A paper describes a structure:
Toxoplasma gondii is one of the most significant parasites that impacts human health, with estimates that as many as one third to one half of the human population are infected. At the Center for Structural Genomics of Infectious Diseases (CSGID), the first Toxoplasma Structural Genomics Pipeline was established. The enzymes selected from the TDR database as small and tractable for expression and crystallization included: phosphoglycerate mutase II (hereafter referred to as PGM), nucleotide diphosphate kinase (NDK), ribulose phosphate 3-epimerase (RPE), ribose-5-phosphate isomerase (RPI), and ornithine aminotransferase (OAT). The genes encoding these enzymes were cloned, proteins expressed and purified, crystallized, and crystal structures were determined.
Residue numbers in the entry:
A (entry chain D): 17 to 248
B (entry chain C): 15 to 257
C (entry chain A): 12 to 257
D (entry chain B): 15 to 259
The structure:
């Protein structure tokens, strides 16, 4: 009843179509992904939503989603803050591999666990591997110890919260209308916190792609209600 | 001397109002389709010659902001921080903003507009605080004190408004070792160049910065230009300067 | 005066006496410390702010020890040590060029008595400039390593000081006030005269008569548009009249 | 073992409650006169060895903040930016804060407190939101979401609360080439050290950081410790370690 927060998950990426684990792989949006953001922007525009600051991960797919939304809402003048803390969950040694070839290699049960589990991460990369963010110039200014070799949702949540408490939440408290453009697991991290969901309950939480999720929060940042801005 | 640092400046391409032959100033109009493509072309040239960036500075006007995004996209630099500031905005055209050039030329005279357009210290007629074109009435600038928001501006004012941002943000980034990109407008960039090259008040009037062409500055240890150049062959560049 | 209310409250304070104020010597950007009396003026200003219940959310200071320590002392005495403090060379004292470090008598005998009165009280006539080879030039000082040399003065008149202060007002101080933050500004005589000149829309001629006393909180009650509704010092009319005379 | 960066850590000296033999935690108590002087002495040692700083990090508790200012004053480094954060605060002692050791011994028992004091993952009894010692009720933390403010903490929680600040601010400054100073507390510094030296959960329990003594870390290109040392002779240092034992 006091503050309004808008969250959005980027649309389909090239690897979502190629049926391959992405994680921190910095792949671009597919043409369909680019358009989901254009549609979400129009809906926000129609309802008169406006923003004062935007937060994003550092992955192209989220960054472009955010730019598209600002463009479609006439909010290109606002500051945009990116952080690796809003990045998708890192899939370790599975990143870049096709899901079928990994399912046939490791088994259908084991991948379902790695995909939908809360605290069991996929096999870790080695520091010599090029998929390790520690070897990527994009993370040059981030200490290597903070860059994951692999992650379970749990790790993702713990890595996201600090950014919520140190940047996002304070902006809301300062009176700013905030937009957050991120990924499925990163956003599940925020929602888990916002709605105080249990470890078991977030496993069933599915955040649809390219649909604005609006949170009406009270004076103490507790949700009064939430809803998606569409009719599909 | 020799280059120690590299700075890249870029002026946004054509806007809808450039085609509609209308004074823009702080009017937040979008790029035309041709303007969007000039940025794509400038990105490729930067990509080809191996330019990379660590931070990007922009005005708060859509035109420049989108030009910047396009260049980062085309150079695979979408991960970098982007900082916007009203200080990099185009020169404010006062009471002329939104008016067609022919209709103002016929109203006020061909001489008087030429003065207001290419003069250094004579600004166009000022707006009143009641006018909606005054940034002080625009929510975009709600966090900026109204005293800093112009009613009108001459190039001189624009230069004075830009320098502080150069000294407080852009230059320090260069000094910190960061490869900087600046996406702004004609007059705001003339402001930086005037300072960089220590141009006189009279000389900057002849300075014409072509639209959608990266301008690269090789600076020494003390931020003084060793040389500058545009990323385009003499053929394409000659045609861009003439427009 | 105006009977309206304050929307915002801003507190400005000029640091107390420095070692060189006693040595009767031009300081400018020379980073000299406060005298023991200077340290105590800040303790007294803190107590007055404490008694009236003033609280702060952020503090702005120059990068000169003198102002910095004044600010720390005030935060300590008001139980505001938890707030962010932002420093900037833009709030530095006016730079006195080639006069910095010299005694008044020895500069008066060297350059002339009246010429110094002009350099000290004038608005637009600066003192003789330093050379880039001189150590008193901030461009050679590690303290300003991250600030482009072109921005660092060789000398300054009040006018120059005002022009370098304003941007910091518009880019940091004012926005904090607009965000709803109770701001404290600990700086120097000329830098504060710069802010006041702007706040009260004073003329070039009028700011020459403006004397800001040392170690006395100056409170500004500003309206929604940052225009002064009224201002006042936290001191009895007795101690205050004596502070202004100095 | 090739050092590149230098980091200086300092634990504030004695507080009024250290003398009054009482659990402090987030209680914002001031330094004792002896505490103020330890910082003056640490500043002189840093001054003598020529240490200079480019930025300083601190908790938001007066005792640490004043320690930092004193060190900057004594090293002629008052011009540098100082960033404070609740993330560097002392460990929060939950329901034990404000209690005297005798008063806690009489009301919680000698065994339970020894566990709460030297344990890694078992926190002291938690406060209720209706308790005034909960930071959520303190204006100092007005700009920090209440969900982040502890009701109680074990060293483990402290560590988890500190790391993000290390990775988001302190470390990047070191990587940017800045000479950093960190003025904080016993448990918050044990957090950093535990990470820096990759100490095990069991080993940090024996780690004792003396008060008012600069701790210098020589780190390699990848922020890994090459070596560390205190600015004090083995004689004066032996006596400081016994004080903190
Ligand atoms: Na890295
Ligand atoms: Na405004
Ligand atoms: Na410098
Ligand atoms: Na709070």
């Amino acid at each position: 009843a006091k503050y309004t927060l808008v969250l959005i998950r980027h649309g389909e990426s090239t690897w979502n179509k190629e049926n391959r684990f992405t994680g921190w792989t910095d792949v671009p949006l597919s043409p369909v992904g680019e358009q989901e953001a254009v549609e979400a922007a129009k809906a926000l525009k129609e309802k008169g939503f406006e923003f004062d600051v935007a937060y994003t991960s550092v992955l192209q797919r989220a960054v472009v989603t955010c730019w598209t939304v600002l463009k479609g809402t006439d909010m290109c003048h606002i500051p945009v803050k990116s952080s690796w803390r809003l990045n998708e969950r890192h899939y370790g040694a599975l990143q870049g591999l096709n899901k079928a070839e990994t399912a046939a290699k490791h088994g259908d049960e084991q991948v379902k666990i790695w995909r939908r589990s809360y605290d069991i991460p996929p096999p870790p990369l080695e520091k010599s591997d090029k998929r390790w963010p520690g070897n990527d110039a994009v993370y040059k200014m981030v200490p290597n110890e903070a860059l994951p070799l692999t992650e379970c949702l749990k790790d993702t949540v713990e890595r996201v919260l600090p950014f919520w408490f140190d940047h996002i939440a304070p902006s809301i408290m300062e009176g700013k209308r905030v937009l957050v453009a991120a990924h499925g697991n990163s956003l599940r991290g925020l929602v888990k916190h916002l709605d105080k969901m249990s470890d078991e309950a977030v496993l069933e939480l599915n955040i649809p792609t390219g649909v604005p999720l609006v949170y009406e929060l009270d004076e103490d940042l507790q949700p009064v209600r939430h809803y998606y801005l569409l009719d599909e």
